[PDB]
Amino acid sequence: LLIIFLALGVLIFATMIYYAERIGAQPNDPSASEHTHFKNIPIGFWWAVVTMTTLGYGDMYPQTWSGMLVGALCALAGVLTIAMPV
Amino acid sequence: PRIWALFEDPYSSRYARYVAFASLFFILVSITTFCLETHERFNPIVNKTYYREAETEAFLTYIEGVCVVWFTFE
């Protein structure tokens, strides 16, 4: 149950943060994402694990208001979905 | 009943469990194709003649077509 909850949360929040961080993307740069650590989704998996476990290394964090909302939701949902079966 | 047995519980039959495993495989393939489509390694920059952008690899589009064919059949 715990591994299923973690996998679902990680996938959903990784996709959400990757799409949120691209709203504030600068149009000038040719690449889709240049100023954000969330250049793709697997990086989102790593960040989602680190953020749901309330670890918070700080190597990668959202830098956009939408990203900040997604990050707050990720932290809260991680606390809940970890405190369910433990 | 035999038609609807494809949407019933997997353990309720053998065809049901087999279609369940197949749909699981195809959903996982779709999710993986999405996650790899969002990557840089599969989005190399190209020159189009006058717009400059990055294009997705053809393999991902073909796999997506296969998965969408399966899902539309189901």
Short mmCIF file of all heavy atoms in Angstrom, two decimals, chain B residues 10-38, unseen atoms left out:
data_model
loop_
_atom_site.label_atom_id
_atom_site.label_comp_id
_atom_site.label_asym_id
_atom_site.label_seq_id
_atom_site.Cartn_x
_atom_site.Cartn_y
_atom_site.Cartn_z
N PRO B 10 -10.83 -9.04 -13.07
CA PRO B 10 -9.89 -9.96 -13.75
C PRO B 10 -10.02 -11.40 -13.29
O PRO B 10 -10.01 -12.32 -14.12
CB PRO B 10 -8.52 -9.36 -13.41
CG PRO B 10 -8.80 -7.92 -13.09
CD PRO B 10 -10.14 -7.92 -12.42
N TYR B 11 -10.13 -11.62 -11.98
CA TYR B 11 -10.25 -12.97 -11.44
C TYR B 11 -11.57 -13.64 -11.81
O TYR B 11 -11.71 -14.85 -11.58
CB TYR B 11 -10.09 -12.95 -9.92
CG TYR B 11 -11.00 -11.96 -9.21
CD1 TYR B 11 -12.29 -12.32 -8.84
CD2 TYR B 11 -10.56 -10.68 -8.92
CE1 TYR B 11 -13.12 -11.42 -8.20
CE2 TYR B 11 -11.39 -9.77 -8.27
CZ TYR B 11 -12.66 -10.15 -7.91
OH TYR B 11 -13.49 -9.26 -7.27
N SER B 12 -12.53 -12.90 -12.36
CA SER B 12 -13.82 -13.48 -12.70
C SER B 12 -13.76 -14.41 -13.91
O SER B 12 -14.76 -15.09 -14.19
CB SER B 12 -14.84 -12.37 -12.96
OG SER B 12 -14.42 -11.53 -14.03
N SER B 13 -12.64 -14.46 -14.62
CA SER B 13 -12.47 -15.32 -15.78
C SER B 13 -10.98 -15.38 -16.10
O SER B 13 -10.15 -14.86 -15.35
CB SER B 13 -13.29 -14.81 -16.97
OG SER B 13 -13.08 -15.61 -18.12
N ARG B 14 -10.65 -16.03 -17.22
CA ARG B 14 -9.28 -16.06 -17.72
C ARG B 14 -9.03 -14.99 -18.78
O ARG B 14 -8.02 -14.29 -18.73
CB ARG B 14 -8.96 -17.45 -18.29
N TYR B 15 -9.95 -14.87 -19.74
CA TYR B 15 -9.89 -13.77 -20.70
C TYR B 15 -9.88 -12.42 -19.98
O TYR B 15 -9.19 -11.49 -20.40
CB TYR B 15 -11.05 -13.85 -21.68
CG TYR B 15 -11.01 -15.06 -22.59
CD1 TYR B 15 -11.54 -16.28 -22.18
CD2 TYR B 15 -10.45 -14.98 -23.86
CE1 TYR B 15 -11.50 -17.38 -23.01
CE2 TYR B 15 -10.41 -16.08 -24.69
CZ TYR B 15 -10.94 -17.28 -24.26
OH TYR B 15 -10.90 -18.38 -25.09
N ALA B 16 -10.67 -12.30 -18.91
CA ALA B 16 -10.70 -11.05 -18.15
C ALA B 16 -9.32 -10.72 -17.59
O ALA B 16 -8.83 -9.59 -17.73
CB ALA B 16 -11.74 -11.13 -17.04
N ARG B 17 -8.67 -11.70 -16.96
CA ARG B 17 -7.35 -11.47 -16.39
C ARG B 17 -6.31 -11.19 -17.47
O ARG B 17 -5.41 -10.35 -17.27
CB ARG B 17 -6.93 -12.68 -15.55
CG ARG B 17 -5.95 -12.38 -14.41
CD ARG B 17 -5.71 -13.62 -13.55
NE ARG B 17 -4.91 -13.32 -12.36
CZ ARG B 17 -5.42 -13.03 -11.17
NH1 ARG B 17 -6.74 -13.00 -10.99
NH2 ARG B 17 -4.62 -12.76 -10.15
N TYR B 18 -6.43 -11.84 -18.63
CA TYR B 18 -5.47 -11.62 -19.71
C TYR B 18 -5.62 -10.22 -20.29
O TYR B 18 -4.62 -9.52 -20.52
CB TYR B 18 -5.65 -12.68 -20.79
N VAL B 19 -6.86 -9.79 -20.54
CA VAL B 19 -7.09 -8.43 -21.03
C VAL B 19 -6.66 -7.41 -19.98
O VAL B 19 -6.19 -6.32 -20.32
CB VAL B 19 -8.57 -8.25 -21.43
CG1 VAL B 19 -8.84 -6.81 -21.81
CG2 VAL B 19 -8.92 -9.17 -22.59
N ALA B 20 -6.81 -7.75 -18.70
CA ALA B 20 -6.35 -6.85 -17.65
C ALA B 20 -4.84 -6.67 -17.72
O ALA B 20 -4.34 -5.54 -17.66
CB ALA B 20 -6.77 -7.39 -16.28
N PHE B 21 -4.09 -7.77 -17.84
CA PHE B 21 -2.64 -7.67 -17.97
C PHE B 21 -2.24 -6.90 -19.22
O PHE B 21 -1.31 -6.09 -19.20
CB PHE B 21 -2.01 -9.06 -17.98
CG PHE B 21 -1.61 -9.56 -16.63
CD1 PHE B 21 -2.54 -10.11 -15.77
CD2 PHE B 21 -0.28 -9.50 -16.22
CE1 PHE B 21 -2.17 -10.57 -14.52
CE2 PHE B 21 0.09 -9.97 -14.97
CZ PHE B 21 -0.85 -10.50 -14.12
N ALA B 22 -2.94 -7.13 -20.33
CA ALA B 22 -2.62 -6.42 -21.57
C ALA B 22 -2.88 -4.92 -21.43
O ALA B 22 -2.06 -4.10 -21.87
CB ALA B 22 -3.43 -7.00 -22.73
N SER B 23 -4.01 -4.55 -20.83
CA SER B 23 -4.31 -3.14 -20.65
C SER B 23 -3.35 -2.48 -19.68
O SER B 23 -3.00 -1.31 -19.84
CB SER B 23 -5.75 -2.97 -20.16
OG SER B 23 -6.06 -1.59 -20.03
N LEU B 24 -2.90 -3.22 -18.66
CA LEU B 24 -1.88 -2.71 -17.77
C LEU B 24 -0.59 -2.42 -18.52
O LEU B 24 0.01 -1.35 -18.37
CB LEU B 24 -1.65 -3.70 -16.63
CG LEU B 24 -0.41 -3.53 -15.76
CD1 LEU B 24 -0.75 -3.83 -14.32
CD2 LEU B 24 0.70 -4.45 -16.25
N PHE B 25 -0.15 -3.39 -19.34
CA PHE B 25 1.05 -3.18 -20.15
C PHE B 25 0.91 -1.96 -21.04
O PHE B 25 1.84 -1.14 -21.13
CB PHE B 25 1.33 -4.43 -20.99
CG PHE B 25 2.42 -4.24 -22.00
CD1 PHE B 25 3.75 -4.31 -21.62
CD2 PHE B 25 2.12 -3.99 -23.33
CE1 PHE B 25 4.76 -4.14 -22.55
CE2 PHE B 25 3.12 -3.81 -24.26
CZ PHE B 25 4.45 -3.89 -23.87
N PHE B 26 -0.24 -1.81 -21.70
CA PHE B 26 -0.40 -0.69 -22.62
C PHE B 26 -0.49 0.65 -21.90
O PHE B 26 0.05 1.65 -22.40
CB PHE B 26 -1.63 -0.91 -23.50
CG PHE B 26 -1.34 -1.65 -24.77
CD1 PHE B 26 -1.37 -3.03 -24.81
CD2 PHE B 26 -1.04 -0.96 -25.94
CE1 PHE B 26 -1.11 -3.72 -25.98
CE2 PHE B 26 -0.78 -1.64 -27.12
CZ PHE B 26 -0.81 -3.02 -27.14
N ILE B 27 -1.13 0.71 -20.74
CA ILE B 27 -1.17 1.95 -19.98
C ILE B 27 0.23 2.33 -19.50
O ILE B 27 0.63 3.50 -19.56
CB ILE B 27 -2.16 1.84 -18.81
CG1 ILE B 27 -3.59 1.79 -19.34
CG2 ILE B 27 -1.98 2.99 -17.83
CD1 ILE B 27 -4.65 1.71 -18.27
N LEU B 28 0.99 1.34 -19.02
CA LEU B 28 2.36 1.62 -18.59
C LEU B 28 3.21 2.11 -19.76
O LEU B 28 4.02 3.03 -19.61
CB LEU B 28 2.98 0.38 -17.96
CG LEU B 28 2.43 -0.05 -16.60
CD1 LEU B 28 3.21 -1.24 -16.06
CD2 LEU B 28 2.47 1.10 -15.61
N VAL B 29 3.02 1.52 -20.94
CA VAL B 29 3.76 1.96 -22.12
C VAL B 29 3.38 3.39 -22.49
O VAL B 29 4.25 4.20 -22.83
CB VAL B 29 3.52 0.99 -23.29
CG1 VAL B 29 3.97 1.60 -24.60
CG2 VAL B 29 4.25 -0.32 -23.05
N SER B 30 2.09 3.73 -22.41
CA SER B 30 1.67 5.09 -22.71
C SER B 30 2.29 6.09 -21.74
O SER B 30 2.79 7.15 -22.14
CB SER B 30 0.14 5.18 -22.67
OG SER B 30 -0.30 6.50 -22.95
N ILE B 31 2.26 5.77 -20.44
CA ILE B 31 2.84 6.66 -19.44
C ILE B 31 4.34 6.83 -19.66
O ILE B 31 4.87 7.94 -19.56
CB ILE B 31 2.53 6.13 -18.02
CG1 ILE B 31 1.03 6.21 -17.73
CG2 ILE B 31 3.32 6.90 -16.98
CD1 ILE B 31 0.66 5.75 -16.34
N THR B 32 5.03 5.73 -19.96
CA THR B 32 6.47 5.81 -20.20
C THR B 32 6.79 6.63 -21.44
O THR B 32 7.75 7.41 -21.45
CB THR B 32 7.06 4.40 -20.32
OG1 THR B 32 6.70 3.64 -19.16
CG2 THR B 32 8.57 4.47 -20.43
N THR B 33 6.00 6.46 -22.50
CA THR B 33 6.20 7.27 -23.70
C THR B 33 6.00 8.74 -23.41
O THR B 33 6.75 9.59 -23.91
CB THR B 33 5.26 6.81 -24.81
OG1 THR B 33 3.92 6.73 -24.30
CG2 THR B 33 5.68 5.46 -25.34
N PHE B 34 4.98 9.08 -22.62
CA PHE B 34 4.77 10.47 -22.22
C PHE B 34 5.99 11.01 -21.48
O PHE B 34 6.55 12.06 -21.83
CB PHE B 34 3.51 10.56 -21.36
CG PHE B 34 3.21 11.93 -20.85
CD1 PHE B 34 2.97 12.97 -21.74
CD2 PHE B 34 3.14 12.18 -19.50
CE1 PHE B 34 2.68 14.23 -21.27
CE2 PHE B 34 2.85 13.44 -19.03
CZ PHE B 34 2.62 14.47 -19.91
N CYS B 35 6.43 10.28 -20.44
CA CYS B 35 7.55 10.74 -19.63
C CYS B 35 8.83 10.88 -20.44
O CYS B 35 9.64 11.78 -20.17
CB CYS B 35 7.77 9.79 -18.46
SG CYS B 35 6.38 9.68 -17.32
N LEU B 36 9.04 10.02 -21.44
CA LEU B 36 10.22 10.15 -22.28
C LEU B 36 10.05 11.22 -23.34
O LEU B 36 11.05 11.81 -23.79
CB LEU B 36 10.55 8.81 -22.93
CG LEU B 36 10.94 7.69 -21.97
CD1 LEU B 36 11.30 6.42 -22.72
CD2 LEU B 36 12.09 8.14 -21.08
N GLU B 37 8.81 11.50 -23.74
CA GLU B 37 8.55 12.61 -24.65
C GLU B 37 8.88 13.94 -24.00
O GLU B 37 9.33 14.87 -24.68
CB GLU B 37 7.08 12.57 -25.09
CG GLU B 37 6.57 13.85 -25.72
CD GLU B 37 5.07 13.84 -25.92
OE1 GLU B 37 4.46 12.75 -25.79
OE2 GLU B 37 4.49 14.91 -26.19
N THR B 38 8.68 14.05 -22.69
CA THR B 38 9.04 15.29 -22.01
C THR B 38 10.55 15.47 -21.83
O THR B 38 10.97 16.48 -21.26
CB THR B 38 8.37 15.36 -20.64
OG1 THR B 38 8.81 14.25 -19.84
CG2 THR B 38 6.86 15.30 -20.79
#
